[PDB]
């Protein structure tokens, strides 16, 4: 009975999204296969057909714009948990962002968003250090090519993140070998090719009927049955009824279904939230329909104009300049060997019975105007800000939602004592062991290490990159030195800081000397004992 | 710093039982003060034991070490009432001190559940009329491509919804 | 009896706002589906349907301008309230603004405002930290997509903020199964699908018959029945009647109705004000009717003109440059394989009985000034001020009303001692208990510290951003140092102020050293015990 309900829900979402679906297929075929559609193909007359697009430089400069402004996701320490666990979580998030597949997914999805609007990569988890001894898992992200063709969001959800959705399908048109390996990496390979992964979120919503007493009110009457279990307790309590907080418990589930036959997998255990995270362009509802827009349609119309005028001009060019004459067959009855083009005769001979020619097409010379008319359309209808704010802020929303999903997966995974490498800010990699406590010093009471086990809020802060802020600081302090009297300790302190803020392999020894001195007059606090001995030997002097 | 010099004094004495009990009572005093972290009190307690006999302060230490900080803050901050309590007899002085310490109260964790939870309910739309228009537009699209079977099924779905 | 009264009021408001609703949805359909209205596709002669709009760049510029103009909402501590509770309340407003959902709601509202005119987002509160132990809640803001038809304001209200409106509906749609599940989540199901969420603001309007005695006048005879109860007293009082101060008590109420069937929910309480706060464009009354505008009407006319002239251009270009001849069928009666276009012969044949051709449409070259004039008009009439003053000041009024409702609901919910984190200015996060009933040690009173509950009025100051103020202060002070003799203590004071006023992770060492120094010679008061120790250590030196 489950199969037909799932199919009905999928069909409903399919129909609801089908407009944006066909429209995005048109867009991707435009931007990835050919710029000319069938619509112009039937409504056209030129013969020699050529498309010289200029949209691709535009999309390249746009994706460069999204590249030059990195987006970072932070983790709010909630439930009174220590900030350091959030710091460690940001460390894992960064060390998972620095991996190559992370850029692969991000770039593919953002490029599809620029052209189509939705690229929507998907989170994945897998075993690492392949050995039967360990069961530690890592978390990766898998991009979906033409995600608008293989990602079907729930129609009821009305969210940027689509996190309002309780379910989503992912179709997979597989070949024979495609069906084989696709099934075997998850399930049995018996075949009924359209296969799908119906993801789904189950939830548990109740009333919980909280009660109050003379003493502080503990949770009472969690369910409807509980009230019938406490019929005397509800009446004899100091306070009868105060609130009905509807606590909810939700769980995501993955199902492997097929269009024709029955589903191959019923429900699967994978994290807490949907591994799929969508990216949107300027997206909204217009008379209650999901609409999201990119830069393909407007630049597309401009490109169609420009390509049709250039092909018209080429059709003008594609002809022999020689004039084609008009005369009777009897008018050249004696002279047929001359009017052939293969020879050059001194004079043209004609019999008794001053002729007309065929008018070759000519340029209107007005085609210039419209040429750049188009040009202007394609190269500034799209852009000109410093960035198309909607694109990167939708990207930031996608980043933060990916943050909560990744945090949920990590919480659902990282319990066993593990050792992981943290990519700190400034890209400083560092190995940090997760847990197994190690006997306490103060109390000898376990105190599980780190224990990122918890509940944090993910939030991004788009703005000054670390490289940008450090360059600004270097320029600022350079100006300061340009406007600072010498001799004063501030001058030298700023000098040392400037050497500290420089590059690596080149000025590493001067930077180290500056750090040493900074620690030695006490401005910089010691973090390693050698600096402490340097401080004490300086201060005793 | 005063805790540190009292620590030096305990170490000097150690290097006696009454002085010991008094100094652990003063250590709980300092723990309570650090919980309070009232800086002007640091002068208040020592001005207090300057004003009062050391035996009275020692008994205050012994009977209630952490409540001693609060009462000495009250008495130093209000030296007049400290003088009247000193004048009136010692046993009822202890009665008044205990009543003042209880006056400040402690751990009032009665109830923190809720206060008039309002109708905090969300909203939802499934865009069903938009879905009717959607079926109409798939009908229009199928008309263009000549997909007759899908066209007729879409027509039936359109006519089935009122 | 209630349902038909609600329906009559809704229909009256719907009839009053029908013109605004249709024009706004027309503008959206123009801007969001197709810029060619039905009249255009009617009144046209074209065959190419291309859409070369320029509205999106201008909208992007405007939205960027609003984004770069942050708005803060302040709360005046009224009735002699402490400034600290108001400060914490602005901290709360800040810590609810920076949440991604609130910002997204704001963006959607403003973009659909610049598009149609109205964004009117929706507040919402819900249980936070789901656990039957507690009942604490947070408040969120969710946008209303295409609010011009899903939100129906009271017709009788005549405010920008619509505080006069005592009712407003929210429109949704259900499928059948959607209908039963929506009922099950809330209410019982009556089978039939458009729904309405008709809210209510009811008030108790009384005169209170304020009475005075030789002593100061206490409120006497609150009701009219009370006067009948004090007939002897009113003649016994020293003063029988002076004033009739109309004290009022009002509450917002929530109800769920449906179009055909009976209402789903009769009476529900959520706060005291209508959570919906609307935004408007150039809004006013034109002959006793509400009107709000956008930047889409005249710009829509101009965009239609540009699109149709460019379609003229494309259609003129879109035909074969080759010339089509006209002749009798017998004129080439034998020679038909000549005139095919499939081959090119040196010459072409004509029998006994110098021919006619088809006139090709040609570019006037006079189109130019039309194209560039329309382009300039559509770029200029929209924008360019430094900001479209009506839009951001209307947004400021919307922020003021939003903060008003925020204060109301927070007063309505946050009576429980709770622990809330404060996002102060410069985004400085810090966690503080709501009341913190801890008793005074110098006084002995319970003295709940903040007790944010009270009555505060909102007032917004758009202008110099905190980052903007920081940057301009840095510029000013660096100029001062440029024009200041060195050696003077004021020189070093300004230096230290600058380093303190600098950015974070970059120059934190100079900033910390500067704060240390400034505390040490006493310019700034110490704040944490290390600072006091540093100050006293310097003083004794």
Residue numbers in the entry:
A (entry chain B), C (entry chain L): 6 to 197, 217 to 377, 388 to 418, 443 to 599
B (entry chain A): 71 to 85, 157 to 303
Which lines from the publication concern this structure?
Tailed double-stranded DNA (dsDNA) bacteriophages and their eukaryotic counterparts, such as herpesviruses, possess a dodecameric portal at a unique vertex of the capsid; this portal serves as a channel for DNA packaging during viral assembly and delivery. The portal interacts with multiple copies of a scaffolding protein (SP) to form a nucleation complex, which initiates the assembly of the major capsid protein (i.e., coat protein) and other minor proteins into a procapsid. The P22 procapsid consists of an icosahedral coat comprising 415 coat protein (gene product [gp] 5) subunits, a dodecameric ring comprising portal protein (gp1) subunits located at a unique capsid vertex, and an internal core comprising approximately 250–300 SP (gp8) subunits and 3 ejection proteins. In this study, we present the structure of the SP gp8 in complex with the dodecameric portal in the P22 procapsid at subnanometer resolution.
To explore the interactions between the C-loop of the SP and the portal, we performed local reconstruction of the C-loop associated with the inner base. The C-loop, which extends from the inner base domain and interacts with a hook on the portal surface, is primarily located in a cleft between two adjacent wing domains of the portal subunits. The C-loop interacts with Val474, Leu292, Tyr191, Phe187, and Met179 in the wing domain of a portal subunit and with Ile266 in the wing domain of the adjacent portal subunit. During DNA packaging, a conformational change in the portal may disrupt these interactions, resulting in the dissociation of the C-loop. Each SP trimer interacts with two neighboring portal subunits, and the SP’s C-loops are embedded in the cleft between these subunits. The portal undergoes conformational changes during DNA packaging and phage maturation, triggering the dissociation of the C-loops of SP subunits from the portal. These processes likely lead to the disassembly of the dome architecture and the expulsion of the SP.
